[PDB]
From Swiss-Prot:
The gene is RNASE1. It catalyses: an [RNA] containing cytidine + H2O = an [RNA]-3'-cytidine-3'-phosphate + a 5'-hydroxy-ribonucleotide-3'-[RNA]; an [RNA] containing uridine + H2O = an [RNA]-3'-uridine-3'-phosphate + a 5'-hydroxy-ribonucleotide-3'-[RNA]. Changing residue 119 to A: Loss of activity. Interacts with and forms tight 1:1 complexes with RNH1. Dimerization of two such complexes may occur. Interaction with RNH1 inhibits this protein. Monomer. It comes from Bos taurus (Bovine). This is Ribonuclease pancreatic. Belongs to the pancreatic ribonuclease family. The lineage of its organism: Eukaryota, Metazoa, Chordata, Craniata, Vertebrata.
Length: 124
């Protein structure tokens, strides 16, 4: 009951802000995107660009994925992103995250028809 594309959108897209506000962005977004349900998702990145700009990456620079697959693509430009990672004080169900805002290239795995992002691999 979620497509790979839709799961990618939910976990990784935050086009409604230009950049993480505040230290509490990650606590709020990890909860609101339902990434804290039965466990605290340990690590997650949100991208502050339009969905079209992110989708476009699937036609940009083809690079290997960490896992050796060959359907990864690296954004030609940097993009506003926020990395969310659990802190030592995080104990499910009181999940706690460090918010780190940055401008980096993103690397995504793409697939399907239409050929769209299905996994966030990394930022550089
Ligand atoms: Cl979909
Ligand atoms: Cl991630």
């Amino acid at each position: 009951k979620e497509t790979a594309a839709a799961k990618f959108e939910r976990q990784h897209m935050d086009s409604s802000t230009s950049a993480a506000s505040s230290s509490n962005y990650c606590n709020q977004m990890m909860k609101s995107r339902n990434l804290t349900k039965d466990r605290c998702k340990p690590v997650n990145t949100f991208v502050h660009e339009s969905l079209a700009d992110v989708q476009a990456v699937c036609s940009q620079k083809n690079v290997a994925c960490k896992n050796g697959q060959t359907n990864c693509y690296q954004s030609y430009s940097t993009m506003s992103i926020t990395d969310c990672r659990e802190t030592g004080s995080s104990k499910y169900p009181n999940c706690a995250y460090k918010t780190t805002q940055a401008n980096k290239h993103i690397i995504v795995a793409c697939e399907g028809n239409p050929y769209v992002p299905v996994h966030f691999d990394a930022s550089v």
